[PDB]
Amino acid sequence: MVRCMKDDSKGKTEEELSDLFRMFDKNADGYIDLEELKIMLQATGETITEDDIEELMKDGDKNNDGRIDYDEFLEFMKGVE
Ligand SMILES: [Ca+2]
Ligand SMILES: [Ca+2]
């Protein structure tokens, strides 16, 4: 009769990929592109070139659309590095 019920958000690894996605989105539309990702890289204090930002979308592009979503993210994180 509802004694243990659901638990609180614990340490999630792969299942936590849902939260990491929003961290890459600038407006949270469900998908990201080079234009958006460009502003995300600005967070760091290094020097990135237009060609460097492409490497992220390239290896990340699984649907060949030029963007990234929860689907392409789950695959792009299935062993890249
Ligand atoms: Ca976006
Ligand atoms: Ca795609």
Curated annotation (Swiss-Prot):
UniProt binding sites for Ca(2+) 3: 61, 63, 65, 67, 72
Single GO BP term: cardiac muscle contraction
Superkingdom to which the source organism belongs: Eukaryota
Gene name of the encoded protein: TNNC1
GO molecular function annotation: calcium ion binding; calcium-dependent protein binding; troponin I binding
Protein source organism: Gallus gallus (Chicken)
Keywords for this protein: Acetylation, Calcium, Metal-binding, Muscle protein, Repeat
Annotated binding of Ca(2+) 2, by residue: 25, 27, 29, 31, 36
Domain EF-hand: 12-47, 48-81
Similarity remark: Belongs to the troponin C family.
Protein's name according to its UniProt entry: Troponin C, slow skeletal and cardiac muscles
